[PDB]
Structure formats: structure tokens, C-alpha cells
Amino acid sequence: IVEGSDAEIGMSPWQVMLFRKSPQELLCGASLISDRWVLTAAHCLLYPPWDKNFTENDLLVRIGKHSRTRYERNIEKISMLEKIYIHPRYNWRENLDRDIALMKLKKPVAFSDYIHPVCLPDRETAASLLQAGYKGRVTGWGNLKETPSVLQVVNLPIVERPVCKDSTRIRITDNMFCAGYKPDEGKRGDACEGDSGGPFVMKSPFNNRWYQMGIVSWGEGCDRDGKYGFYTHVFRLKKWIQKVIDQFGE
């Protein structure tokens, strides 16, 4: 997270750290949508050029964390992965279209002050909130610059589609949205490498719940003028998310 600030404790209780077993390495961010299911970006799990093609027993999730490096005794919860789910039409070779992956946990987590799930948006909420000029929130332990000790937080306005499309040469899809300040708006901030899988959340003024509208997917550099971070459109792909989660008995 570039040009942001430290998270408050319990500010992002749905924040999940995707962690490699061997060697011990922070891999990606992620979101907690139930005691059992974790949402992330697909290129965290499957991006073959970077030797990323992980199976279930390669990875673990760390839930409820604030510190990047420090283990937190009675705060964080570590769970193994039962099954990895990647969108059927995920496109890693071109533009990271449908950059979305679900993870089933072997060990379900108990909710606390530091652990709590984020809502997935229904159609009306997504239509009412996912609009240009409206600000969302991005969290992560990713890079502070292009080149943190604790979780980082930045609020970014959703950018209209023509501006997202013109800012880049990479092909834009309706399964994406971009966010960030325009150069003539003065303010700044962006996601960066390491932030992927991290939630792009918005607070509803109607029921004052937090909804995850996006997943940190891709971008060109970090916090560059005239450039915008691109996010997986969660609701556009909510039809796949529904099929995966509603499959099994409780």
C-alpha cells in the first residue's frame, strides 16, 4: 500500500494473510467472507511465469493479523487449505480477466474482536455504491513503494470506465474496475505488489455494513500520476462465488 497510513486494531477484521509454508514468505492479501471461506486473487495461487501454481498443502492463511512479521499469540489464527477454487475463465496469459479465487479452510475460525467476515454485495448495493467518484477502502501488507511493519489502509475513489481504459494499453474487461485519484485532484494513494487478494471494501450508508466490492488484481507501477490500480469486480463474478460456497452442507 503506497501513500497510506497504519490500520487501527480491528479496522479490517476480514483481512487475511496468504502465507507460503516453505520457505516462510508473505505471498498475498485475502478476505474473510465466512468462518470457512477466504476470497483472494487468482494470480496469488496461479501465475505460472512466477512459478506460482500452488496446491492445497503448499499454503496457509493467517487471519486476524495486524503486524506483518510478528506472530500474535491469542490474536491471529492459522488455518490450512482444504480446497482451492479458481474461476473457470480466469485469464493469466493476457489481462488477468476474472482474477478471483476461493479457499476452503480445513480449520474454521472463531469470530473475535480481530476476526470478522465481510459482506458480499447484493445487486442493489453494488449498483448503489460501485459508482464513479465514490470512495472505497484498500488494505494490505504489500510494498510501500515501487523500489510495512503493520497493515496499511488507503481510501480511493472509483474511476469511470473511459478514464480507466485510456490510462492503460492492457485490455480492460467488465470484470474489472479501476480506482485512485486523478492527477488534477492533488491527493494520492494506491495498492502495490503484495496487496493482491486484498479486499476493496465500501461501507453502506443504508445498513452501515462493510461490503467487499473488489479484489486487488493488477496495475502498472504504484501511485503513478495518470495511472490507476485495477480491481476484480466481485459482484460481476458473484454467480461463480455462489456456486462454489453453496455446494456443501454446513
Binding site: 487501527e8 465466512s34 473475535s112 470478522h116 467518484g133 477502502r137 481510501n155 461501507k203
Partner: peptide, 28 residues
């Protein structure tokens, strides 16, 4: 899942976070 999006240390405590208002004010 039924209690999603309500933070124990914020919404459930009736406490506003550091930059929460930046989101609410952008809906104009």
C-alpha cells in the same frame, strides 16, 4: 455471514474509525 460487515471494535461499539467519514462524504 449473517452478522457480516459489522466490526466488533467499531460498528458494534458505535465507534467511528479514523477515515470512515471520507467514504460517507463521497456519496454526494
Amino acid at each position: 455471514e449473517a452478522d457480516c460487515g459489522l466490526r466488533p471494535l467499531f460498528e458494534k461499539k458505535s465507534l467511528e474509525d479514523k477515515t470512515e467519514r471520507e467514504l460517507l462524504e463521497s456519496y454526494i
